[PDB]
Design a protein around this ligand. Structure first.
Ligand SMILES: C=CCNC1=N[C@@H]2[C@@H](O)[C@H](O)[C@@H](CO)O[C@@H]2S1
Length: 703
């Protein structure tokens, strides 16, 4: 209804937008708010509309109703008068943003509102690894922040070469500089502080030469319009991690630059130890920063872990040490460590009562800018009014705002694209919770030979139908073309999941052998299509491919497919393959966890899925990979957790050529030097059983 929800709102009657109005204070009030107001409109005889900041003539009558907080405002609508009065210029702009949401069909509700943020700095840090947001995406983002009362945008793409090492020393070229100039201007028009960050720690020298280069870079950005600045020391090693040096540098920028210019706003640093588990208690890095860094300077913090939600105990832990309220860097929805997943679910987990305990709250988003508006909108609501923060309603409101013409379809898509999957940070999100109980019940019964509930079967049927509807509708949506460009690969994979799910359910209901077999063949072809999408879309270097509906739906479908094929093989004494993911290559083994470990293709690599359990490698047993063709080989790398095995390659499986594995901490490796390869074979040739841990088994070929 109103986002963010105001601190104070008074319920009844309806007032039409005055066809004739008298404007009071258009020449004294925030020009950015006036422009918004004249846009919403279209003389002295008419109804009075008072706009202005506390102190202006236009609103002196309502001085006692205007909240005495920065960015606060007072809004009133009744039959005779409209009041739009901020405590300051940004507060007046934020009054117009709320006013704009109130306007419906030219009709306004009779309301009185007192409002202001609970958290002083609220917004976004473009701080991820990956392709930095496009210029057109950044322009759209700033307008979005202004509409949602987010007042902070911290520019810091890790892979922008003029942000980080070594070319943080170099001024932006004319083209990029002109774009940053535009960004800064658009930010100002939308009441957003543009904070330009620099990331010099990996190669900074603690000498005068690098100090001066950093300040000269800051001066250039200031000439481009930048009035807020940040220095990042995250994700570095070496002398740059020295807290005393970091604090002296930031205090120098403060005293010789930030407090020398007339109009610099935020000065922010992010530390090397930026979460609790990365803090070494055997030293005292954080208390050195807390005590030496000038108190006006902000210190960023991601929580108890690199990826974590903010708790009351956690914020108190850090605050005691840095001697000031932490400026939260919240690592959601950033996906740069799970780049084959979209993270489109609700924003939750952050304590709603600790607004006084944080200096700021910013979200690190996905490199998918439009897709991140779901989380950004929700953080905007949370940060402005946490006590009233409504996780699910705000998620639904965000989707309806981003894609009104297809909000139900985006909800369906987002609901099943929210978990991260397994990852090194251990961070997960709920997903598909609506249908998860019916999936769990259906699969337990089916596996056990008990009757499943008809209602559960139909819930699954319904889900797959709605998934196909939503996929096809989103693909053709033209209301937010940039969004659809971002999600399309996942949309394609999402539809394929839904079609597969339908066909497996028909295998469950199947009543004759011929019909079952058509469905089985259809499922296999769909598996092959998902493999194709996984290999040709989103081919980034770290987590290539496209994964969707991974927490609940894909396991349901795969396990149901496997179970019904097992039942068919039993019933008809048949030997249908029950594999659930297409794999063009083959692998066979006499060792067994390995025999059932699936191969994977990632870029030009062919690898055995690593396991976690003990692999007992018997005396004579082996593992042999057979590729679907002859390829020029690059290397083989193995990791067993070696005077017992023998690595051989071949083009025909008859004539073999032994390859010698080189040993090292990084472990068993061997170059192939473009030799043709189709078969790789690893055979235990010693006499005692050798138990191992397959951490990796990877062949790389030239494509
Ligand atoms: C307060 C400092 C936090 N800085 C961080 N730098 C890194 C970010 O650039 C990543 O996007 C993020 C997710 O992979 O992990 C850490 S968090």
């Amino acid at each position: 209804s109103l986002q963010p929800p105001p601190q104070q709102l008074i319920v009844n009657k309806t007032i039409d937008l005055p066809a004739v109005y008298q404007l009071n204070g258009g020449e004294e009030a925030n020009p950015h708010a006036v422009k918004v107001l004249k846009e919403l409109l279209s003389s002295k005889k008419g109804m009075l509309i008072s706009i202005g900041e506390k102190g202006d003539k236009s609103v002196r009558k309502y001085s006692r109703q205007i909240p005495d907080h920065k960015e606060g405002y007072y809004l009133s609508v009744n039959e005779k008068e409209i009041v739009l009065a901020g405590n300051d210029e940004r507060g007046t702009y934020y009054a117009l943003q709320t006013f704009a949401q109130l306007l419906k069909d030219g009709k306004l509700p009779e309301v009185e509102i007192k409002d202001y943020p609970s958290v002083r700095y609220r917004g976004v840090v473009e701080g991820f690894y990956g392709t930095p947001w496009s210029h057109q995406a950044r322009l759209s983002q700033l307008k979005f922040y202004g509409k949602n009362k987010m007042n902070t945008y911290i520019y810091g793409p890790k892979d922008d070469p003029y942000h980080s090492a070594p070319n943080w020393r170099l001024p932006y070229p004319d083209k990029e500089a002109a774009q940053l100039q535009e960004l800064v201007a658009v930010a100002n028009e939308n009441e957003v502080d543009f904070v330009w960050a620099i990331h010099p720690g990996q190669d900074i020298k603690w000498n005068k030469e690098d100090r001066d280069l950093l300040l000269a870079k800051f001066e250039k950005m200031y000439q481009l319009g930048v009035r807020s600045f940040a220095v990042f020391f995250d994700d570095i090693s070496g002398e740059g991690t020295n807290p005393q040096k970091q604090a002296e540098l930031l205090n120098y920028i403060d005293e010789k630059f930030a407090q020398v210019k007339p109009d610099i706003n935020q000065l922010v640093m992010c530390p090397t130890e930026y979460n609790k588990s990365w803090s070494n208690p055997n030293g005292n890095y954080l208390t050195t920063l807390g005590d030496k860094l000038n108190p006006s300077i902000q210190i960023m913090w991601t929580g108890d872990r690199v990826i974590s939600d903010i708790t009351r105990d956690g914020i108190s832990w850090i605050n005691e040490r840095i001697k000031r309220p932490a400026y939260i860097w919240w690592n959601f929805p950033v996906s740069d460590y799970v780049r084959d997943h979209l993270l489109l679910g609700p924003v939750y987990g952050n304590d709603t009562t600790i607004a006084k305990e944080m200096s700021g709250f910013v979200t690190n988003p996905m490199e998918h800018a439009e897709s991140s508006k779901i989380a950004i909108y929700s953080v905007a609501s949370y940060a402005w009014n946490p006590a009233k923060y409504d996780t699910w309603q705000t998620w639904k409101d965000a989707i309806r705002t981003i894609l009104p013409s297809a909000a139900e379809e985006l909800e369906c898509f987002a609901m099943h694209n929210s978990d991260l999957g397994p990852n090194g940070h251990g961070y997960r999100r709920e997903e598909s919770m609506d249908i998860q109980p019916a999936a769990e019940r259906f699969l337990k019964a089916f596996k056990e030979g008990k009757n499943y509930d008809k209602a559960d079967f139909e819930t699954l049927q319904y889900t797959f139908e709605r998934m196909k509807e939503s996929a096809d509708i989103l693909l053709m949506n033209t209301e937010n073309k940039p969004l659809i460009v971002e999600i399309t690969p996942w949309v394609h994979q999402f539809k394929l999941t839904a079609e597969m799910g339908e066909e497996v359910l028909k295998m469950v209901e199947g009543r004759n052998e011929s019909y079952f077999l058509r469905k089985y063949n259809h499922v296999k072809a769909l598996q092959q299509q998902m493999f194709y999408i996984d290999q040709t879309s989103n081919q980034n270097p770290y987590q290539p491919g496209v994964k969707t509906a991974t927490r609940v739906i894909k396991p349901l479908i795969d396990r149901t497919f496997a179970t019904v094929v097992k039942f068919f093989n039993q019933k008809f004494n048949a030997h249908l393959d029950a594999t659930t993911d297409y794999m063009p290559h083959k692998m066979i083994s006499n060792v067994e966890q390995i025999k059932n470990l699936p191969l994977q293709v990632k870029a030009n690599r062919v690898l055995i899925s690593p396991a976690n359990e003990v692999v007992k490698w018997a005396a004579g047993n082996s593992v042999e990979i057979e590729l679907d063709a002859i390829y020029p080989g690059e290397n083989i790398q193995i990791n067993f957790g070696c005077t017992w095995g023998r690595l051989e390659i071949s083009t025909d499986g008859k004539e073999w050529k032994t390859v010698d594995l080189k040993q090292k901490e990084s472990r068993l490796s061997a170059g192939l030097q473009k030799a043709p390869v189709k078969f790789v074979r690893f055979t235990n040739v010693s006499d005692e059983e050798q138990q191992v841990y397959l951490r990796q088994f990877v062949l790389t070929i030239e494509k």
